[PDB]
Amino acid sequence: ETKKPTFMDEEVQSILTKMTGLNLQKTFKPAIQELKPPTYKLMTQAQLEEATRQAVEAAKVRLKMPPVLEERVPINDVLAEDKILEGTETTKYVFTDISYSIPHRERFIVVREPSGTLRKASWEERDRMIQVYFPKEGRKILTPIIFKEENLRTMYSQDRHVDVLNLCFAQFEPDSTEYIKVHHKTYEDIDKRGKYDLLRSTRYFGGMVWYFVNNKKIDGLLIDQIQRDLIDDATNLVQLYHVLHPDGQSAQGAKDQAAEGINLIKVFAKTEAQKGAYIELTLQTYQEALSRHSA
Amino acid sequence: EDFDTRILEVRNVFTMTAKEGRKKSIRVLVAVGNGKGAAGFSIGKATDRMDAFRKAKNRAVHHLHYIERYEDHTIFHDISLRFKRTHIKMKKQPKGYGLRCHRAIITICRLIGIKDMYAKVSGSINMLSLTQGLFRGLSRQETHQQLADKKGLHVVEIREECGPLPIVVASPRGPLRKDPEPEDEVPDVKLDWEDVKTAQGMKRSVWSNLKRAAT
Structure with missing residues (x-):
């Protein structure tokens, strides 16, 4: 009938790509590494504009958003219960198929328990075993301690949210429970302290917006976009909100009033926004400065 | 007060004289610099070593070179020159590389203000030839602004740590050429076998790349 968009829909990706932004100085910040x-090169103005164009293409690749996946369902599947082996071993065996040309989500990894039960390895056992035999650079077999709540608050205090997300992306699978828990705790610390600019021009801005829109908490990000004269992004945010919440007070108000542009933010501010007063004030201020520039 | 003085060589010179036989004098070579590109050297000659020190260091401050530095830490480009029989090959290096050079070059580089450079001295290792050979090569280095003005093109710096981002370091003050620089499929530039042998993993030396104190 009428399906609500997904994160990977071309319409949503286009909206989130623009709201993210592209900054070549931040996207290609100098890395602290062996130099x-x-x-x-000696370049003409045309060769320089072409070299900058190629850098923009390489940046749009580096800003490719990771897909937002739902939590994976725990694996609890028994292949066999050979009870004659009960009590013959004290430690369980983990068998991993290491055939090279198999996707890691299709590799049979089974566990022979001391009870004699042959079962499929758990998601956590699978990722640990895949790292043992197919080690991925940046991933550790044992979970790093940086992901403890006490150590993430340290990283947040230093405004290292992008490092937290780079570390989580390297350690955990996108559908893992640790990956989603860490991303959500990071998105929430950004919303509470208004640190949305830390993720602009990164591949993590869209996932953050997706989280706020689905949880109906875009008031902080919408204010941040207006204070920065990003009304085009602020207006797209309100439209993405309506697209994902069609049967809502704000979406209907826009239909009844045929609102467009800045009017969408006014409709949203009154009906569904929790900080409706702070948005109208923040939006009023913007229109004033725009009139001063016009005059 | 802003200038520091460093000794590079103290020699005892013996002069045979008509009536007094072998006499002993002192020849001193000293370098001066303020660490901000202004540096010089002078020879001093006196019977007493302390007098030779005073003559050289006071004279050197009146023969100052200005040495251009890239980002105030290294040279603008690789410099390879010969002065008499002393060869000096210098390489531009990134920050953190330090001064991996003949100890006398290290001393002079601290006076000039160069922090990161590699240098290899070959042939005769004559301190005077090395000192004046080094200053000759450092004073004749073309900066990026000079390169842009000479060729009327942008000078674009590509750093691997910054990926494909093009960093314009210098733009011509005059008009900007519209014709690209000709792309000679193969450059006819002369290469150093030592540099090539190293890049090909064929350079084996127990003394190269040894751990040393910070310089």
């Missing part, structure tokens, strides 16, 4: 002497 080599730089190279130099």
Whole structure:
């Protein structure tokens, strides 16, 4: 009938791509790593504009958003219960199929328990075993201690939210419970302290917006976009909200009033926004400065 | 007060004289610099070593070179020159590389203000030839602004740590050419076998890349 959009829909990806932004100085910030002497090229204005164009293409690749997946369902499947083996072993065996040309989500990884039960490895056992035999750079077999609540607050205090997300992406699968818990705790710390600019021009801004829109808490991000003269992004945020909440007070108000542009933010501020007063004030201020520039 | 003085060589010179036989004098080589590109050197000659020190260091401050530095830490480009029989090959290096050079070059580089450079001295290792050979090469280095003005093109710096981002370091003050620089499929530049042998993993030396104190 009428399906609500997904994170990977072309319409949503286009909206989130623009709201993210592209900043070549931030996207290609100098990395603190082993250095080599730089190279130099003599370029005309056309060769320079082409070199900058290629950098923009390489940046749009580096800003490719990770897919937002739902939590994976725990694996609890028994293949066999050979009770004659009960009490013959004290430690369980983990068998991993290490055939090279198999996707890691299709590899049979089974566990022979001391009870004699042959079962499929759990999601946590699977990712641990895949790291043992197919080690991925940046991933650890044992969970790093940085992901404890006490150590994440330290990273948040230093405004290292992007490092937290880079570490989580490297350690956990996108559908893991640890991956989703860490991302959500990071998105929430950003909303509470208004640190939305830390994720702009990164591949993590869209996932953050997706989280706020689905949880109906876009008031903080909407205010941040107006204070930064990003009304185009603020208006797209309100439209994405209506698209994902069609049967809502704000979405109907926009239909009844045929609102467009800045009017959408006014409709949303009155009906569904929790900080409706702070938005009208923040929006009023913007219209004033825009009139001063016009005059 | 802003200038520091460093000794590079103290020699005892013996002069045979008509009536007094072998006499002993002192020849001193000293370098001066303020650490901000202004540096010089001078020879001093006196019977007493302390007098030779005073003559050299006071004279050197009146023969100052200005040395251009890239980002105030290294040279603008690789410099390879010969002065008499002393060869000096210098390489531009990134920050954190330090001064991996002949100890005399290290001393002079601290006076100039160069923090990161590799240098190799070959042939005769004559301190005077090395000192004046080093200053000759450092004073004749073309900066990026000079390169842009000479060729009327942008000088674009590509750093691997910054990915494909093009960093314009210098733009011509005059008009900007519209014709790309000709792309000679193969450059006819002369190469150093030592540099190539190293890049190909064929350079084996127990003394290269040894751990040393911070310089």
